[PDB]
Design a protein around this ligand. Structure first.
Ligand SMILES: COc1cc2c(cc1O)CC[C@@H]1[C@@H]2CC[C@]2(C)[C@@H](O)CC[C@@H]12
Ligand SMILES: COc1cc2c(cc1O)CC[C@@H]1[C@@H]2CC[C@]2(C)[C@@H](O)CC[C@@H]12
Ligand SMILES: [Ca+2]
Ligand SMILES: [Ca+2]
Lengths: 174, 174
């Protein structure tokens, strides 16, 4: 299938931004394949409010890292095997009850429990390959640029998708 | 080497309690091997204050789980492969800067970052196979009894160890 580069130019911004109608969401999971030799960077960032309800999945020291900041939890957690071996890796991130589940290559590697509740606005934004605020604003800053490739990505439900933007045309890893 | 049973009788209390002088601690890591077919239970609990500075490592759905409650963080997190396959597994838990690192069979499977700071009293208690407060007091309750075996366990520095207790004689898995 067609693969896209996760970074463009200086790698200072996302390659794409998707907006979703929270009230129209029926599927709270996303999956994709990623390949990279880069040990650090942002795979995706998401929020309902950059001020107080945001989430980031990235790599640090080659391994998956999640940072989360919302009403119920504030955390910085590393888990899973290194993914920077230049091989394609399947990744799934989903909400399971009050938990966030991270699966890598079919195996559950991390489950953040009690991090959700009955999230700011009825709109969720998902940015690929970058953040929607300065990196200095992360709980634990890292350099966002992730020199890798993304393919076979499915995000929530297309029916709940409000819109999609791209600062520039998506560069193919072909 | 000699192995010990992690549960006794009804599995309502720890098989042993160790107390340490925080000010005498130079090594902030522990390691041990565990074997079990039990998917849920407490491997060890530790605190400096059962009221507001405690930590628990156990199994839930066969996989490692850590619950932590202190001044800097409050979390419930699952990670790593299932350990309830009846095989011996090496486990290491250590403090690395402001993080808690969990290694299983030589592989880092979880790193809780930004959970420590410059912890209540100068005394730390470590209880094996049970908690030092009701299970209902966990962030996420579980049934503490862990039907497994422990061996080759090293806890912090023997020099910092103040005392050790055991409600009853340690039952051998021999
Ligand atoms: C658990 O709390 C939160 C979680 C989340 C967010 C905010 C929270 O407060 C924003 C991005 C979300 C992610 C949960 C997992 C999602 C749905 C992925 O499948 C795609 C976008 C991700
Ligand atoms: C990160 O914060 C905390 C961490 C901890 C405790 C309290 C905290 O507030 C108590 C038990 C400790 C564990 C850190 C890891 C230790 C040292 C293991 O090697 C043996 C006992 C464990
Ligand atoms: Ca990078
Ligand atoms: Ca049990």
């Amino acid at each position: 299938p067609p693969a896209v580069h996760l970074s463009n130019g200086p790698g200072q911004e996302p390659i794409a931004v998707m907006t979703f109608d929270l009230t129209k969401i029926t599927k709270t999971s996303s999956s994709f394949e990623v390949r990279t030799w880069d040990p650090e960077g942002v795979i995706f960032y998401g929020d309902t409010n950059p001020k107080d309800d945001w989430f980031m999945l990235g790599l640090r020291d080659g391994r998956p890292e999640i940072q989360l900041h919302n009403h119920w939890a504030q955390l910085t957690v590393g888990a899973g095997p290194r993914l920077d071996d230049g091989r394609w890796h399947q990744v799934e991130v989903k909400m399971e009850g009050d938990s966030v589940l991270l699966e890598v290559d079919g195996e559950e590697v991390l489950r953040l429990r009690q991090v959700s509740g009955p999230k700011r606005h009825p709109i969720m934004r998902i940015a690929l390959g970058g953040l929607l605020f300065p990196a200095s604003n992360l709980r634990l800053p890292l350099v966002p640029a992730l020199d890798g490739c993304l393919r076979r990505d499915s995000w929530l439900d297309k029916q709940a998708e409000i819109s999609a933007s791209a600062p520039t045309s998506l560069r193919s890893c072909d």
